[PDB]
Curated annotation (Swiss-Prot):
Recorded family membership: Belongs to the colicins ColE2/ColE8/ColE9 and pyocins S1/S2 family.
This protein's encoding gene: imm
Protein known as: Colicin-E8 immunity protein
Organism for this UniProt entry: Escherichia coli
InterPro entries per UniProt: Colicin_E_sf (IPR035900), Colicin_pyocin (IPR000290)
Molecular function GO labels: toxic substance binding
Length: 85
């Protein structure tokens, strides 16, 4: 989706509504796919959907641990996470 063209225009909680969008499925699979491009796009986070469909043991499998790994990946990579919340 042609949403906020970067993570630093996201906040952690706007990204939650996208990340929750999918986990719930506010949609028809296709809506998750349309997110899932976007979830690469803003993030640069190389896994994409691997944090969502193949999650590991840091992961709570909720929208929380992905937001975390997006913060934590971006900052570990030296990059901007979302907004300063």
């Amino acid at each position: 989706m042609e949403l906020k063209n970067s993570i630093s225009d996201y906040t952690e909680t706007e990204f939650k509504k996208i990340i929750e969008d999918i986990i719930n499925c506010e949609g028809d699979e296709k809506k998750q796919d349309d997110n899932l491009e976007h979830f690469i796009s803003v993030t640069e986070h190389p896994s994409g959907s691997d944090l969502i469909y193949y999650p590991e043991g840091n992961n709570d499998g909720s929208p929380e641990a992905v937001i975390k790994e997006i913060k934590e990946w971006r900052a570990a990579n030296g990059k901007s996470g979302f907004k300063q919340g």
